[PDB]
């Protein structure tokens, strides 16, 4: 009855903080393209929504753009979670779950999302749950300490997500921990 | 393959401008409750989103709340469009289509929705189209002139849409007309026009 239900192979979700080495980790699977459906985070979609860079606007003016940005993230995630494939294995960077439990909940906490906007997103999440199939068979948590994550971010000659405070990575770290450690199967890796 | 696909009976959508007499029209069908699934516009949901009145915030500060508001409307409409029922006939006040083609498009035009937010809603609409079955068998257009509607609005008790200016009702009228008469928009399903004078 749910959309995409029974159309998806064994699926693995790569979860981790900003700067936990997810892009790096996923580069290793690229030789296996032909047997593995391999979906990196759709940052490029977020940067170019018919010309508008949602990601930037979100980092620039969070109180105006958090709602639209997260709405869109959620869409692009669903678009991945549901994309048809012939391959026997599917691997995604992040998921609708990280969006809901980490990033959105964090924007609510530090006050960038007003309660009214948050609730709108949350009613959607509830409705998505009932109407779309999001296949999820195993999560690989690339665990790290906020401090180690900060390093990388700044090492990387880089761009958007680039300009985040440590307190923010701390807050995100804790949310990932609440979701992944303190309570499908979770495989924790030390990415230090 | 789409959600709710083949779970829905013959569906009628009541479209019309603000103040076109939809609420009045739909009161006539209330004696038939037992045979007819009857879904009025979920304004009460929009007024109480865990305490927050999106509808008000939207009319007070459109540039901040248009995006969240419409996103929510779209959700509630889908909730109606897909709600299970045993009845042989389903009747909705407005639809996801009026939301997309009239109200959202109008908020883009008068600049309350930024291009960026508009685009987000639009990408959703496209994805909704592909994944969630929206049953629609006949639309009943309660057609009126902006002036008659503006007047009907003025006679009623106050809150919310009351201070919608006539120019706004004009803009909305034309968008409904484009959609349901001039048929400038991608819709299938017969249209039955009624003179709501
Ligand atoms: N739900 C999400 C997903 C991603 N991002 C940001 C974090 C880094 C950048 C790409 O990763 O996008 C975010 O703020 N919220
Ligand atoms: N998609 C919608 C649907 C309704 N409304 C407003 C129009 C008047 C009010 C009650 O109807 O809600 C709106 O702005 N956008």
UniProtKB/Swiss-Prot annotation, chain B:
It is an enzyme of class 2 (transferase). One of its GO terms (molecular function) is uridine kinase activity. It catalyses: a 2'-deoxyribonucleoside + ATP = a 2'-deoxyribonucleoside 5'-phosphate + ADP + H(+). Transmembrane segments: none annotated. The active site is at 93 (proton acceptor). GO terms for cellular component: cytoplasm; mitochondrion. ATP binds at residues 16-24. Changing residue 34 to D: Reduces enzyme activity towards dA, dG, dT and dC about 5-fold. Keywords: ATP-binding, DNA synthesis, Kinase, Nucleotide-binding, Phosphoprotein, Transferase. Substrate binds at residues 41, 59, 70, 94, 161. Subject to feedback inhibition by dTTP. Its EC number is 2.7.1.145. One of its GO terms (biological process) is nucleoside salvage. Deoxyribonucleoside kinase that has a broad specificity phosphorylating thymidine, 2'-deoxyriboadenosine, 2'-deoxyribocytidine and 2'-deoxyriboguanosine. Specificity is higher for pyrimidine nucleosides. Several anti-viral and anti-cancer nucleoside analogs are also efficiently phosphorylated. Monomer. Belongs to the DCK/DGK family. This is Deoxynucleoside kinase. It comes from Drosophila melanogaster (Fruit fly). The chain holds residues 12 to 208 of 250 of the full protein.
């Amino acid at each position: 009855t749910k959309y995409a239900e029974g159309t998806q192979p064994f699926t693995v979700l790569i979860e981790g903080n900003i700067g936990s080495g997810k892009t790096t980790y996923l580069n290793h699977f690229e030789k296996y393209k032909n047997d593995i459906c391999l979906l990196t985070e759709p940052v490029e979609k977020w940067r170019n929504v018919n010309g508008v860079n949602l990601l930037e606007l979100m980092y620039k003016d969070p109180k105006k753009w958090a709602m639209p940005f997260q709405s869109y993230v959620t869409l692009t995630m669903l678009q991945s979670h549901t994309a048809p494939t012939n391959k026997k294995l599917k691997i995604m960077e992040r998921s609708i779950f990280s969006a809901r439990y980490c990033f959105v909940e964090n924007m609510r906490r530090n006050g960038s999302l007003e309660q009214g906007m948050y609730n709108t997103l949350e009613e959607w999440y509830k409705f998505i749950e009932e109407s779309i199939h999001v296949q999820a068979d195993l999560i690989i948590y690339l665990r790290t300490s906020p401090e180690v994550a900060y390093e990388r971010i700044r090492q990387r000659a880089r761009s958007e997500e680039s300009c985040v405070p440590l307190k923010y990575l701390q807050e995100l770290h804790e949310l990932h921990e609440d979701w992944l450690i303190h309570q499908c199967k979770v495989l924790v890796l030390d990415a230090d």
